[PDB]
Amino acid sequence: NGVLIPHTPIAVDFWSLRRAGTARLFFLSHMHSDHTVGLSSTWARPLYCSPITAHLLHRHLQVSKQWIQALEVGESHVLPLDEIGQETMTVTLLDANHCPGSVMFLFEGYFGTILYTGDFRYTPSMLKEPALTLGKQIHTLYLDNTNCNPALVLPSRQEAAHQIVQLIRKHPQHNIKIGLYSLGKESLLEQLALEFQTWVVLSPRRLELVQLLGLADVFTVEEKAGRIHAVDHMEICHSNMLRWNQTHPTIAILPTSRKIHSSHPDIHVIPYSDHSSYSELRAFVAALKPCQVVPIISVPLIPDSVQQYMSS
Ligand code: NI
């Protein structure tokens, strides 16, 4: 899902080195496991991400802080595009509403004005951003088209949370297992501690993420402290259901955005989305008025100092 912006040394969510070649500036929109393969402690090329994303990157992939130029969201920053003090480029990061520390990259330079949305959840608060309200003409919109496919309809983030509450409402005497990825859906955990008036059980790593975000003190790591446990999504399987059901009558919930058949009756696959709906995007593009939209073309005039930067 990485993107090499053609005729630029720009790479967003791309870390293959050998497949890039021309790339010299690598951006990280958010810290989901799917957009970061090749990133580790051996990574030694400049990297730009959001504040929260900077903490999560150094801590959980052991990436050296010397390669992580973290920039504040909302503000525009001047990045070099060569080895001399000549060409530069402005980047403005915009909150993506997708997950903790998720951003949208807005580039400006010899290539034009490119807006990279990455993964993002649309809300009309996004149009009111000062970066996109100066009437600037975006030349290319690398847009999140996840829910633009006409295949299978996934409910919104709030529709799925309603079904989860109805599910636990019908099982008041049950232990609830919730499978998640390494990031996202922490605010949903908060909504379940309120509705059901329990403490939510996490792993120590997940507890660190939550305190990093500034959420309510409704979480704990003691197993016996609550009926709702948050576990890794790869834990929810037929073998583990029998293991949990041997102790206490347990229900398992899998919030996923893919077609999955429950391999156990007490496993409930709930369709999540976490991306903008089609109509939300069609109003998002009708407001931006971009010259062209690219899913996740014109060749610019590469300067002399930038053409050398790409070939070393
Ligand atoms: Ni993501």
Numbering used by the authors: 2 to 297, 314 to 329
Q: Which statements did the authors publish about this structure?
A:
In addition to the structure of SNM1B1–355 (nucleotide form) we solved a structure of unliganded SNM1B1–355 to 2.8 Å resolution, hereafter denoted SNM1B1–355 (apo form). For the apo form, only the M1 metal binding site was occupied; XRF revealed iron, nickel, and zinc present in the crystal, with nickel being the most abundant. This metal ion is coordinated in an approximately octahedral conformation, with a bonding network (H31, H33, H99, D120, and a water molecule) and co-ordination distances in the region of 2.3 Å consistent with each Ni2+, Zn2+, Fe2+ (39). D35 which forms part of the second metal ion coordination site (M2) adopts a different sidechain conformation in the apo-structure compared to the nucleotide-form structure. Overlays of the structures of SNM1B1–355 (apo form) and SNM1B1–355 (nucleotide form) reveal they have the same architecture with similar relative domain orientations. The most prominent differences lie in the ordering of the extended loop connecting the final β-strand on the MBL domain with the C-terminal helix (residues 297–315), and smaller but still substantial shifts in the two regions connecting the MBL and β-CASP domains (residues 146–159 and 266–279). These regions cluster around the 5′-phosphate binding pocket, with significant shifts to both main chain and side chains required to accommodate the AMP_1 in the apo form structure, suggesting an induced pocket. Presumably, these regions are relatively flexible and move to form favourable interactions with DNA upon substrate binding. However, whether these structures represent the catalytically or physiologically relevant forms of SNM1B is not clear, and it is likely that the presence of Ni in both the apo and nucleotide form crystals is due to the use of Ni-Sepharose in the purification process.
